[PDB]
Design an enzyme around this catalytic site. Sequence first.
Site, PDB file in Angstrom:
ATOM      1  N   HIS A  83       9.362 -37.884  35.620  1.00 27.65           N
ATOM      2  CA  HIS A  83       9.638 -38.443  34.282  1.00 27.65           C
ATOM      3  C   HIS A  83      11.035 -39.093  34.195  1.00 27.65           C
ATOM      4  O   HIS A  83      11.426 -39.545  33.108  1.00 27.65           O
ATOM      5  CB  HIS A  83       9.440 -37.389  33.181  1.00 27.65           C
ATOM      6  CG  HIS A  83      10.481 -36.315  33.129  1.00 27.65           C
ATOM      7  ND1 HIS A  83      10.163 -34.981  33.268  1.00 27.65           N
ATOM      8  CD2 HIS A  83      11.813 -36.363  32.892  1.00 27.65           C
ATOM      9  CE1 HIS A  83      11.260 -34.256  33.147  1.00 27.65           C
ATOM     10  NE2 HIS A  83      12.276 -35.070  32.924  1.00 27.65           N
ATOM     11  N   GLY A 104      19.428 -33.054  30.388  1.00 25.31           N
ATOM     12  CA  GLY A 104      20.068 -33.426  31.628  1.00 25.31           C
ATOM     13  C   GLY A 104      19.904 -32.428  32.751  1.00 25.31           C
ATOM     14  O   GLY A 104      20.266 -32.739  33.892  1.00 25.31           O
ATOM     15  N   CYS A 118      17.012 -31.284  33.902  1.00 23.83           N
ATOM     16  CA  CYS A 118      15.795 -31.501  34.671  1.00 23.83           C
ATOM     17  C   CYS A 118      16.149 -31.863  36.105  1.00 23.83           C
ATOM     18  O   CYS A 118      17.140 -32.549  36.365  1.00 23.83           O
ATOM     19  CB  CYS A 118      14.953 -32.602  34.034  1.00 23.83           C
ATOM     20  SG  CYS A 118      14.306 -32.129  32.404  1.00 23.83           S
TER      21      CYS A 118
END
Lengths: 306, 306
Positions: free
Chosen positions: B41, B143, B145
Amino acid sequence: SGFRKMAFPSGKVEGCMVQVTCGTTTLNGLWLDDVVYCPRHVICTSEDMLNPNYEDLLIRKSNHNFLVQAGNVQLRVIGHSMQNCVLKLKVDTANPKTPKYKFVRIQPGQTFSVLACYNGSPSGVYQCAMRPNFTIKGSFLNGSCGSVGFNIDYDCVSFCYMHHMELPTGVHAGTDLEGNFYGPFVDRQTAQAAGTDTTITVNVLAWLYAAVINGDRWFLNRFTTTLNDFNLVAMKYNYEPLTQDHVDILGPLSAQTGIAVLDMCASLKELLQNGMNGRTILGSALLEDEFTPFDVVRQCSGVTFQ
Amino acid sequence: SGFRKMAFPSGKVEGCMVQVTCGTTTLNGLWLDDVVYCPRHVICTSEDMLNPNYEDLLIRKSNHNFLVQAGNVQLRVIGHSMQNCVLKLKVDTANPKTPKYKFVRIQPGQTFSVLACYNGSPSGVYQCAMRPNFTIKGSFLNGSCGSVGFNIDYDCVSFCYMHHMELPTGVHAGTDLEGNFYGPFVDRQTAQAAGTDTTITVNVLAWLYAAVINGDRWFLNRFTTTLNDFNLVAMKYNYEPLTQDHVDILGPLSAQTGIAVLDMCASLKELLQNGMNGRTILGSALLEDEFTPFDVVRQCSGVTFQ
Ligand SMILES: Cc1cc([C@@H](C)Nc2ccccc2C(=O)O)c2nc(N3CCOCC3)cc(=O)n2c1
Ligand SMILES: Cc1cc([C@@H](C)Nc2ccccc2C(=O)O)c2nc(N3CCOCC3)cc(=O)n2c1
Ligand SMILES: [Ca+2]
Ligand SMILES: [Ca+2]
Ligand SMILES: [Cl-]
Ligand SMILES: [Cl-]
Ligand SMILES: [Cl-]
Ligand SMILES: [Cl-]
């Protein structure tokens, strides 16, 4: 979101851990620049730890008696000296993995990360607080002496703790990196015990702020209090007295959440007087006091490091 | 002595963390050999996360659109591919800090350490468990991820988790390093919620063994039980059913302490039926279920790592 007991990344410290052997005893040392730091009781036999005369025991030691091993590579010892309760070994090679660092003597109530090590090999990392009675509640087995505690500020590692002793209580005592013990403890296996373990009030308040920031707010109430009124309650429950300095340090968390510090104190007061009634806060059924206000702001904002 | 929620030393993983930017979005990637792994993503805008067509969004991306930065140094991307929910970026340089590693898909109830990162910079380390409902209770902000979870076996890092999503509940979901989500979750901001959060019975039992090894034994009683009798209680309290395989895994802890597994089950049964009555166990007022039997043996023996 979410709140966790979080340690600093330990890589910078891992690169400084070595094994120190003096004849029979092996523990951990900290290698920074061309000096290795370790507990002076490395020069002791278990027969010596009752009433050791460290100065006399050190007279019979030469540089070549101190075997220092960084992982697999042996370091050459070209000098040794005793500073308080720490032994400093001068080696002929600067640690190429030396991070930017400082030595700091922390205050009770402040937190730090511990890299538990055995035979110079890192085993695990966890977060600790210097208790008001100058002990820490750690996880240390035989051979863990010389493991260090530290804080990381962007690129700089501030070493604040070296592990020396386990008290009969099961709690732990040690020194700063100049070798001065925290609290009244000595590196002798004598009759020493910890004093009253008081709760770090300002940390509990910071952790309640952390809880509100995450949706755990069932403990907020319609009440307020005063510093002197709250402190009557703190005393009864063996909490540290709260000062205006503590209130000020909580300022940023009060501003962020819009919860007046004294309003949060009234919430804590009710929690102390009534308990939790089988509820939980941030996954805990007890009031947590090993998060500082800086810790809560750090985690709740995402500050990173070199 | 002492028991603590202990993470693995994170240095080996710190050396693999990088920053991945695709136009507008920045998160973390994992650099092993000449491949960088990150959540797919990264190619999405916040406008896309409702109903993203990842295959179509990836058609408009070329190698030079993926900006990869290891600390200060930029990596050259020479290929990209999607594998399940992870993007793999081929770079022209092998990570010189690549540790010996493996990719593992862990089972619910198993534990691992998380290195929380932002912009490719490590922020903190803490211990997690894969919940029976395939969520983890972590500490992740925007942030984070691409932060990974891992176990360390002497010299080998077994990567088992990459962080992708925070559910409305406040718990966290992610994938193994082949990009397959744990549980039924998808990398879409839709209506997904966690199922029943059941307690990991075998871990609670291991932690009770850890408590006895440390002098917390007030919960030992004069009773015993059977697997089927205990499981009637486990069900009522939303505990996982205990199997003979669980009993066998607890064997070493039963042998070390001389406490029959089913005797400890009768202690847990009484704790579930009566509560703790305001007492504590290893500093907890709740029954802890994020220590595996291996975790307890590990900590209680002092196993170290490369
Ligand atoms: C080359 C060098 C240097 C030192 C001392 C002066 N310096 C250090 C000793 C240990 C660790 C760091 C240093 C330092 O100078 O930074 C030193 N100190 C020794 N001592 C033993 C008797 O009591 C006094 C200490 C012995 C030795 O061979 N030394 C060798
Ligand atoms: C030099 C190389 C290699 C690859 C592929 C074959 N190999 C990898 C791609 C990404 C990460 C690792 C590898 C690998 O071979 O280990 C690769 N795959 C691309 N894809 C885009 C279209 O859909 C299929 C994938 C594009 C590209 O420029 N590639 C370049
Ligand atoms: Ca610099
Ligand atoms: Ca090798
Ligand atoms: Cl580090
Ligand atoms: Cl080194
Ligand atoms: Cl490591
Ligand atoms: Cl690197």
